[PDB]
């Protein structure tokens, strides 16, 4: 694309500058350009990719929720049209991320940390699609999210310790999927509780810095359990 002429290292450098400037659309375009160079991404680079697109889609999700609430309260064409416009842009971003994962980040990811991170992302972006889905493919979108999360869970349980932040963030997001998308609050609670308890029992193995990383995610599990019970 438009980033094809820029050096990979320059794209990464500019992604970091865009982050500092809170220019997340730019950040995502730079990281898409970096992915399209065809090389695998390092851990730091995978995190930059995720930060960029999560912030872009986050603004779209927040706007969609505002507009959907207005639309539901109203029930001319303008509210529906504008909600649809935001929805379509949101779906486009999700399709873009899913396309990067399919071409060819996931298939080249052999190490647990990369493969789980990308499969979790695949689940997340199908989950964002599911939040707005209403048609004959809502069930299939939900199943796609579930399938990606499940593959990531299976690998994470075999290959990562229970405190690994990627494993924790995956389990957290799969629990949110169960509660918010799949009409499965009991599964959500069970997953969050077992994840929390098994992480707590493994904290003793960690350095101070890793402890901080793991307990930050554990706090989110606890917060959700408080909300859900």
């Amino acid at each position: 694309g438009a980033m094809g002429s820029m050096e990979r290292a320059s794209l990464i450098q500019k992604a970091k500058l865009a982050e500092q400037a809170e220019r997340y659309e730019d950040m995502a375009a730079f990281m898409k350009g970096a992915v399209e160079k065809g090389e695998e991404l390092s851990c730091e680079e995978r995190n930059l990719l995720s930060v960029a697109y999560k912030n872009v889609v986050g603004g779209q999700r927040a706007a969609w929720r505002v507009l959907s609430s207005i639309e539901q309260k109203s029930n001319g064409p303008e509210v529906r049209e504008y909600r649809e416009k935001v929805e379509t842009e949101l779906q486009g971003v999700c399709d873009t991320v899913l396309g990067l994962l399919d071409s060819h980040l996931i298939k080249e990811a052999g190490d647990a940390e990369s493969r789980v991170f990308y499969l979790k992302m695949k689940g997340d972006y199908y989950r964002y699609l599911a939040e707005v889905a209403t048609g004959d493919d809502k069930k299939r979108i939900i199943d796609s999210a579930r399938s990606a999360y499940q593959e990531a869970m299976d690998i994470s349980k075999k290959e990562m310790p229970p405190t690994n932040p990627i494993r924790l963030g995956l389990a957290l997001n799969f629990s949110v999927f169960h509660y918010e998308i799949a009409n499965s609050p009991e599964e959500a609670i069970s997953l969050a509780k077992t994840t929390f308890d098994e992480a707590m029992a493994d904290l003793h193995t960690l350095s101070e810095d890793s402890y901080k990383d793991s307990t930050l995610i554990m706090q989110l599990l606890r917060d959700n359990l408080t909300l859900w019970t």
Partner: peptide, 10 residues
Amino acid sequence: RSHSSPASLQ
């Protein structure tokens, strides 16, 4: 709404 993961994970 429920809390989901931060984007950056180590």
